[PDB]
RNA sequence: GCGAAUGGCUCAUUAAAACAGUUAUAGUUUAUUUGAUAAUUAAAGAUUACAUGGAUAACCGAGCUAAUUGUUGGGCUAAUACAUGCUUAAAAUUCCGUGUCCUGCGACCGGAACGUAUUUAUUAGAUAUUAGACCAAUCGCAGCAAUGUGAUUGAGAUGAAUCAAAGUAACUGAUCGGAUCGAGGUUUACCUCGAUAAAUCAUCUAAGUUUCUGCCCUAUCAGCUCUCGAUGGUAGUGUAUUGGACUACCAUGGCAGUCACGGGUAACGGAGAAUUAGGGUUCGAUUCCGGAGAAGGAGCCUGAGAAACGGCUACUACAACUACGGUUCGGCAG
């Protein structure tokens, strides 16, 4: 009966603080639940596990105690597929996460760009491989092979770090979920403000 | 508390029932339906002490139990010992067909109003709430619990509808605004019948509301508890003891003993 | 770089703009959360044009005020964005037929927005529990002067 | 033979799993055998008699599995009139074809 | 399948704690009720929907123990139990094909996605408090173009929303979308009124937590809280949700003679009770309400709901039976 119930405190003036009612239910304290990553099933051959938990209402709570796969979406063009994460890198919160690749809600981490280098490429005729073929077009431009066109000088300024990552073929990204809630996980891909700060994080982290 | 409630006490249940005090020790407890405990009279209080159809307890086990169906409550059928029947419904007894308002005195007692085939018709809603659901769509609710689809537009939330029972239809309605009549469900002023002076809204959390009458008497009221019995002096439903104003107790007197 | 890092591990918005801003190149792309409490309550010019990152803001967050609004003197200016506002009633004893002196000390959080100082008249609103003692905010903040004691300072405000 | 199951010198049944020649006290939880419900949860300490057979053991069921040359009279005179017929549409019409 | 978490007894604990009078829930859960709402069953699979599949009580029969609403073990058949599952709308929107025409990512053509909910990211929701003007560009209304026109229709709700309703992208698929049940009619094609299961929004009911104000003696109680939280900030956990409620990192605060902190109380708080010129004095275990508890103490199953306690687990102290192996539906503050 783990309860959160603040009568164990002591009022501002940190004077002891009275009881007569025992533990009541209602104040449930669930025990914590850590989460990793298979990334690397040396040992962990069961992918993703998750346990739903019997919550208040009648609901069910599905709680994510293993993982390997989640959903991230690039802020900029709106996209959004299912990905393989890949490894957890600062938590913020505490470095024994990432020590542990546990997933806080807002856990940075990195993905593959498979899917979205997929889509940069069948969008805009931009691959993102290794920059010398950058491009792949059509043999002949009459129809609409001419949108690819438009959209790629639509200025698609991808910043000089989004463009290092997916030839690199990791992604930088943060979550936007409560594993031990949902028993999802999923991020929006790392840019501007955040990124080039982040990143600073991991720079001068590891130098 | 252990978990919700489930009894209800003799001595706790409600002034508006005009219950028996030596009674026994309890009193029905009204169901959970479309009016809050305290505002509503469940049907064994109806036929029971009310009407007197009923008598001892088991009365009316018969009564709503017995495969004729005696009680309807807005054109519907009823077999709750404890139907919350609420301000402003429309009850029948099947076997006389009678029909009847559910409206408070001016004293605040429930008081039984009998209706002519004409207005048992007719039911006056008042708007609880309103705002647009699923699929691009228009939703009115009434304290009456109604949930109503597709509403004529140029109503505002606090507005008051009269209902065609017979056709589930909506006719004439009119909001709350300087210049109508209306009916108070609640307060130290419940009963009462008057002419709305002015809404002035404080936003703090309570805006209040006046009111003048026949002798011309001044209320004061919180807007919750106003009901637009009629738009524009001409009220809409026929009222229980007289109209719908009550007497100085030095009033009352002159009136029927004539001091 | 300052607003931002400044020790805590990053700071954004409920309106997670940003990066994607990039993509309206043209029109206005700094945007901030804005709002407005109303409630007969001004929106602080300085809350609008800050780089600052509070959520527990009522003009920069979905943090609501409902019911309680006060107006109190202030105490303290410590703590990170929290402060502590003095209120002084008089209080009736029944016997006697008189009254004696009382204060309660009130936890109040303050948005950047509007700038401190101690022993000024500041105006409280009535938002969810944001700690342990916190459940107010500052919503208008009104520059006072006292010479010296705040504790001395005893004002049916 | 199957040794269908156990019961101790003291009415003490097995339960297969509990893989150890004594008895052990547990908790029941529902799905178990040696155990009744009454209000979900009715989660009681019972005791009960191992898995593994020992001497200590009074009764032990046995299942016949393939009967031998030999001819015992209790179990080849029987002729047993089971009395429920299919009641569900379908199980009826697998009996009778159709 | 519901109920058993109502009631009933008691006051030991308990002095801003509980309580009361007030307020909040834009920080939440609520089985039963009342009103309303659903054209699309997801992919892979599989496929009957005039409708699927497997097993088990009761029963038959064998048995154990000295013992209890103990229970082994073999055979038999039904469900609203369990398990699995069939169901063509169009338009629109978005995207794709090196498809035509044309250059507007425009038009026609063809292909794909498309309920609801879940989980994120993003677009727009036009604070109808808030008037207008000129040149350019885009935009949309006529539109082959020319030239225009027009800036209009608009705007549910609140004191206020990162509200309601909605567009795009993808995720989970353990959300839902009825393989059930009556009765009364009637020359057919069936017809009429009901039961019940169950999703979301309301609604009722109740519950958490919450704002402010108020308590008896006492300094032969003056400094208290802070090694782990004491006060605030950050990020996460966790919860029904808020919160240091718990973790990590950071700041050093928070309370006090307008009596902190600590101690006593034959102190559960009110509604009220006894005497009363007025003002007071003394009580409130005790029919209403709220709280707490069930031998002391902690833990938990289950459920919409209790740390329940006329339910369970272990310890301390006990109560009942014994063939001393073991057992108890063992807790009268009903
Ligand atoms: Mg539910
Ligand atoms: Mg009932
Ligand atoms: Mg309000
Ligand atoms: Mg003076
Ligand atoms: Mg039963
Ligand atoms: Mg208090
Ligand atoms: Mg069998
Ligand atoms: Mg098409
Ligand atoms: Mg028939
Ligand atoms: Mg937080
Ligand atoms: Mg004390
Ligand atoms: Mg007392
Ligand atoms: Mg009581
Ligand atoms: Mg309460
Ligand atoms: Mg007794």
Redesign the pocket.
């Known amino acids: 009966?783990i309860?959160?119930?603040?009568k164990?405190?002591?009022?501002?003036?940190?004077?002891?603080?009275?009881v007569?009612?025992?533990?009541?239910?209602?104040?449930?304290?669930?025990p914590?639940?850590m989460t990793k990553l298979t990334t690397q099933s040396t040992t962990i051959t069961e992918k993703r596990r998750?346990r739903?938990?019997?919550?208040?209402?009648?609901h069910?709570?599905?709680?994510a105690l293993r993982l390997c796969e989640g959903?991230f979406?690039w802020?900029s063009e709106?996209?959004?597929?299912?990905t393989k994460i890949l490894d957890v890198k600062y938590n913020?919160?505490?470095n024994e996460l990432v020590r542990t690749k546990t997933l806080?809600?807002?856990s940075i981490v990195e993905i593959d760009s498979t899917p979205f280098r997929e889509w940069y490429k069948?969008?805009y005729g931009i691959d993102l491989g290794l920059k010398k073929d950058r491009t792949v077009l059509?043999?002949?431009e009459?129809?609409?092979?001419?949108?690819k066109r438009?959209?790629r000088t639509?200025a698609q300024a991808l910043e000089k770090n989004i463009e290092e990552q997916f030839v690199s073929q990791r992604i930088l990204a943060c979550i936007?979920?409560?594993?031990?809630?949902?028993?999802?996980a999923?991020?929006?891909i790392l840019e501007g403000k955040e990124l080039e700060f982040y990143i600073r994080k991991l720079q001068s982290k590891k130098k | 508390?252990?978990?919700?409630?489930?009894?209800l006490?003799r001595?706790?249940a409600p002034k508006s029932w005009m219950l028996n005090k030596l009674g026994g020790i309890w009193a029905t407890r009204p169901?959970?339906?479309?009016?809050?405990?305290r505002e509503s009279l469940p049907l064994s209080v109806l036929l029971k002490e009310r009407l007197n159809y009923a008598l001892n307890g088991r009365d009316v086990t018969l009564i709503l139990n017995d495969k004729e169906q005696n009680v309807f409550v807005d054109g519907?059928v009823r077999r709750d010992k404890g139907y919350?029947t609420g301000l402003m419904d429309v009850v029948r007894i099947e076997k006389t067909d009678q029909s009847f308002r559910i409206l408070y005195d001016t004293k605040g007692r429930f008081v039984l109003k009998s209706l002519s085939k004409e207005e048992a018709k007719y039911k006056l809603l008042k708007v609880?709430?309103?705002?647009?659901?699923?699929?691009?769509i228009?939703y009115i609710?009434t304290?009456d619990?109604?949930?109503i689809?597709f509403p004529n537009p140029e109503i505002?939330?606090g507005d008051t509808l009269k209902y065609d029972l017979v056709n589930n239809k909506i006719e004439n309605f009119a909001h709350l605004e300087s210049g109508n009549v209306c009916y108070i469900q609640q307060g130290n002023n419940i009963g009462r019948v008057g002419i709305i002076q002015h809404i002035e809204?404080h936003?703090g959390?309570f805006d209040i509301c006046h009111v003048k009458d026949a002798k011309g008497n001044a209320f004061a009221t919180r807007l919750g508890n106003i009901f637009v019995l009629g738009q524009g002096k001409k009220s809409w439903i026929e009222l229980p003891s007289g109209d719908g104003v009550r007497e100085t107790i030095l009033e009352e007197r002159k009136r029927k003993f004539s001091y | 770089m300052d607003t931002q890092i400044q020790?805590?591990?990053?700071?954004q918005?409920?309106?997670?703009?940003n990066s994607?801003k990039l993509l309206a190149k043209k029109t206005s792309a700094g945007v901030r959360?804005y709002?407005?409490?109303?409630?007969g309550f001004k929106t602080p010019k300085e809350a609008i044009e800050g780089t600052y990152?509070?959520?527990?803001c009522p003009f920069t967050?979905?943090?609501?005020?409902?019911?309680?609004i006060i107006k109190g003197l202030v105490?303290?200016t410590?703590?990170?964005?929290?402060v502590?506002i003095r209120?002084?009633y008089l209080?009736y004893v029944?016997?006697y037929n008189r009254y004696?002196?009382?204060?309660?000390?009130?936890?109040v959080?303050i948005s950047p927005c509007f700038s401190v100082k101690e022993g000024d008249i500041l105006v409280a609103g009535?938002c969810?529990?944001?700690?342990?003692?916190?459940?107010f905010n500052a919503l208008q903040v009104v520059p006072n002067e006292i010479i010296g004691s705040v504790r001395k300072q005893?004002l049916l405000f | 033979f199957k040794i269908?199951?156990?019961?101790?010198?003291?009415?003490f049944?097995?339960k297969?799993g509990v893989m150890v020649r004594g008895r052990v006290?547990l908790?029941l939880?529902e799905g178990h055998?040696?155990?009744?419900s009454?209000?979900?949860?009715?989660?009681?300490?019972?005791?009960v008699r191992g898995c593994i057979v020992g001497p200590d053991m009074?009764?032990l069921?046995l299942?016949i599995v393939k009967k031998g040359v030999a001819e015992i009279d209790g179990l080849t005179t029987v002729t047993?009139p089971?009395?429920?017929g299919?009641?569900?549409?379908?199980?009826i019409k697998k009996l009778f074809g159709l």
């Open positions: 009966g309860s959160r119930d603040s164990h405190k002591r009022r501002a003036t940190g004077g002891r603080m009275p007569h009612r025992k533990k009541r239910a209602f104040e449930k304290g669930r914590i639940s998750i739903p938990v019997r919550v208040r209402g009648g069910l709570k599905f709680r959903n979406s802020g709106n996209i959004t597929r299912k913020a919160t505490n806080v809600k807002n069948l969008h059509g043999n002949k009459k129809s609409r092979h001419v949108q438009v959209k639509k936007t979920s409560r594993p031990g809630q949902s028993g999802r999923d991020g929006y | 508390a252990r978990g919700p409630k489930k009894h006490k001595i706790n169901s959970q339906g479309p009016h809050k405990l519907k919350p609880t709430a309103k705002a647009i659901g699923p699929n691009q228009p609710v304290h619990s109604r949930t689809r505002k939330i809204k936003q959390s | 020790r805590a591990y990053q700071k918005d409920g309106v997670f703009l994607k959360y709002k407005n409490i109303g409630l990152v509070d959520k527990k967050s979905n943090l609501s005020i409902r019911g309680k105490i303290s410590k703590m990170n964005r929290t502590i209120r002084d209080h029944r016997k004696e002196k009382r204060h309660r000390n009130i936890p959080h009535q969810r529990p944001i700690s342990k003692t916190v459940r005893f | 269908a199951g156990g019961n101790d010198k003291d009415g049944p097995m297969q006290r908790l939880s055998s040696c155990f009744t009454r209000r979900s949860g009715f989660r009681k300490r019972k005791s009074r009764v069921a299942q047993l089971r009395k429920l299919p009641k569900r549409a379908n199980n």
